[PDB]
């Protein structure tokens, strides 16, 4: 029919894209940021330990 069931048609699409992003897009990219912060931190810690 004509106007309001699109309120649930768009809501269902929204929730599906949010759950997909939360499991298959966000975790693999945030992990690379966590790793680089440790790669730089390990270099600064190794330099101080080597000097001492």
């Amino acid at each position: 029919m004509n106007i309001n069931a699109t309120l649930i048609g768009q809501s269902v699409a929204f929730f599906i894209f949010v759950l997909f992003c939360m499991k298959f897009v966000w975790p693999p990219v945030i992990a690379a940021l966590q790793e680089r912060q440790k790669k730089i931190a390990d270099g600064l810690d190794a330099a101080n330990r080597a000097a001492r």
Partner: protein, 286 residues
């Protein structure tokens, strides 16, 4: 055709529903769609919102399925800049451990930005291409999905469900009704706190139901007014005059240069108020 007919055709959607006889068919006139009841679907809005949501997630998945944890390639450099921008936006407002708040904000910002960006391409290109591919000359087809109040209302009614959910999930059923009736006008004594429960309810209920409406109608009012001015500037060319088709090109350029700032700002406002309204549902702000 006339300017009134040209404008009236651009404002109608590709509707599909219960015609006088059968739940399978497209409406051929505006009135044939107004006759149809409450159980409804716009095939042009749901065809652009779902397609752009899948194109966004597919491009972002191509930059996640092969993430390096070392030196980044051209595509994943951009996706990391978007993820880090959203993470920073969420950490400057929300202090809890919730795993849903950040991917929701990234999905909301990049998806709404794409739903709005298609407004920059000429307004008659997609409607005429759809008509030529279909073989019709009276086909209703609206491409910008945020110019449909239903698309914007669906995006804010789902965020409201998440607000009522997290508020009950962390404050409990007692804490939810407690915020709605014992605040903000909390009295020191019992004989007066009960003469302030009708008041606390009106103010907190109007404020709670107005967050979904203001989020949907701020986005709808800024996009419906943006495309309507492009349609009126296209009527300047229909005159056939030279000193009008020259002023129209200069106005079209100035409007497109202004609208990309609004298209970017509206996606940012929806994301930041979604982060703020979900963060204030996790703590007692009073």
């Amino acid at each position: 055709e006339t300017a009134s007919g040209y404008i009236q055709h651009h404002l109608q959607n590709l509707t599909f529903g219960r015609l006088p006889n059968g739940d399978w068919g497209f409406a051929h006139t505006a009135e044939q769609a107004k006759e149809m009841g409450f159980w409804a679907f716009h095939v042009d809005t749901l065809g652009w919102s779902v397609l752009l949501g899948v194109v966004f997630l597919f491009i972002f998945r191509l930059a996640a399925k092969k993430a390096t944890s070392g030196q980044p390639g051209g595509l994943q450099n951009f996706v990391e800049v978007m993820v880090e921008f959203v993470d920073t936006s969420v950490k400057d407002t929300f202090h809890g451990r919730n795993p849903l708040i950040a991917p929701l904000a990234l999905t909301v910002f990049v998806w709404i930005f794409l739903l709005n960006l298609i407004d920059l391409v000429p307004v008659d290109y997609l409607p005429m291409l759809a008509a030529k591919i279909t073989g019709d000359e009276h086909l209703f087809f609206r491409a910008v999905a945020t110019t449909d109040p239903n698309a914007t209302l669906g995006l804010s009614i789902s965020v409201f469900a998440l607000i009522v959910f997290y508020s009950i999930k962390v404050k409990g059923i007692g804490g939810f009704l407690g915020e709605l009736t014992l605040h903000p006008f909390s009295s020191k004594n019992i004989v007066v706190q009960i003469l302030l429960i009708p008041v606390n309810f009106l103010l907190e209920f109007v404020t709670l139901i107005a967050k979904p409406v203001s989020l949907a109608l701020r986005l709808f009012g800024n996009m419906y007014a943006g495309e309507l001015i492009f349609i009126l500037i296209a009527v300047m060319f229909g005159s056939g005059m030279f000193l009008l088709s020259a002023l129209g090109v200069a106005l079209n350029w100035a409007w497109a240069v202004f609208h990309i700032l609004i298209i970017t700002l509206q996606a940012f406002i929806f994301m930041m108020l979604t982060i703020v309204y979900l963060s204030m549902a996790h703590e007692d702000n009073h």
